[model samples]
Target: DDGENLRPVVIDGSNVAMSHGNKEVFSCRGIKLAVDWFLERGHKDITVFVPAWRKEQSRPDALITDQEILRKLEKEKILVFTPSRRVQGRRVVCYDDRFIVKLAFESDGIIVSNDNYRDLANEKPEWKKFIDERLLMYSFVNDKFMPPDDPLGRHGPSLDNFLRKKPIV
Candidate 1:
């Protein structure tokens, strides 16, 4: 996600949350890591669009230690949308996906997710141009943001794909 000439990066919150490691429960660390990457790379136009239901469902129990980081980002206006419903007559599958995709399209933003957005893209492959370009493909591992190709090994130990590398202990 080098992100030149792209609009804000609209994060797929649920997709990103799925990638957070088990080191912490209710971990929302993935988004923070991605934001860190964007800010460090000077891609300060980044924004997150999380569904209202997702926050209602997951935030209350996030590990206490990570709450501050999440709160700080929220304070920074990182969350730009809290879409709660699919547009009338829109063919998108779920409100969560519809809202994020709609926000990205309207803002000319690039998506950031591990999802293929299969249902949303159904017969409209062009809707997901970013996915093929790797613009929508990034994940967090061990507190760092990494592109799809580097999701497990941009640096440090293998994480998601480290089963083979794990010591036989």
Candidate 2:
């Protein structure tokens, strides 16, 4: 309880950046816009998680200095987890997916990502709840992030589906 009673939202930086209205791939605008939205909504707590791999893919000429923007947001109390590290045992092969899933579970926060995280769910069923209940579905329309037009369109995996469930014969 950070005194606000609202848990922070965990965001996938790369996913947001690529999907933002500016279309600035690997730029910092997406994170900024998302944070601005939360702030305007009076939810001050937000954590933008950027995988180490995504951090490695920065865009210098994309309007704003990505590193500077991230640092500024971090300085302002909005936490930024660039170069995300794994807590032992909660590992996944994909970098962004690992950060997105881990933070969402540990912080009990809603997740924001274009990805459905189906593969991770197939491997770790416990995460299915985050997909079904705690996802903050948004999309860029007319230069804004709004509730998706199709709410249930992002559901992850079917009840009968999971990796290695069927015999590999």
Candidate 3:
């Protein structure tokens, strides 16, 4: 069963709640807030997609399905989609570039990711097939978005304060 019960899962507080490949901080809150802020500012045409990581934790509380999240997002008028097929297994994890590229090209939106996953995006020749080089890809380290940039393997925002702009939300 999908985690249908835990509707409206709290997404704030944590730096990120989504599996965006390169957002060092994976600021789901930032992304949400950004989406909200942008919508308010009339950037309503933008699209937001969250890739399905595949598999529910199978815990006692419940099984949360991507469907539940999608429904919730629908209420907010936010468009969302999960990858048709999951990345699957440790050995196959490296193939996520195909997934990322597929998402970016199919939707024609910027693919969010982190420096660590950039290689997975299109680092190799074969990977080019998965992602179109022309597609605009967005990436950042955990430090780039976190209030206290923690990419240093510690805590606190990045030293590059000049880069940290206020969230529109």
Top candidate on lDDT is: 2
Q: Number of clashes in model 2?
A: 0
By lDDT, the candidates rank as 2, 1, 3
Return the top candidate by TM-score. Answer: 2
Please provide, for model 3 over 1-169, each residue's C-alpha lDDT reduced to its tens digit, 9 standing for 90 to 100: 3322211111211113333323232334445543453344333344455444423343434223233544455467564544445345432322444544555445443333332344654466544542332222222254244222332334423323212223122
| Candidate 1 TM-score over all chains jointly | 0.62
Task: Give the alpha carbon lDDT tens digit for every residue of 27-129 in model 2.
Answer: 5776788778777655666778765444443446533336566768767866556554456855333456777788878877677777788877787778886
Worst 10 residues of 2 by lDDT: 158-167
lDDT of 2: 0.63
- lDDT to native, each model: 0.58, 0.63, 0.37
- What is the total number of backbone clashes in candidate 3? 17
Question: Number of clashing residue pairs in every model?
Answer: 0, 0, 17
In order of appearance, the predictions have TM-scores of: 0.62, 0.67, 0.36
Model 2 pairs whose backbones collide:
none
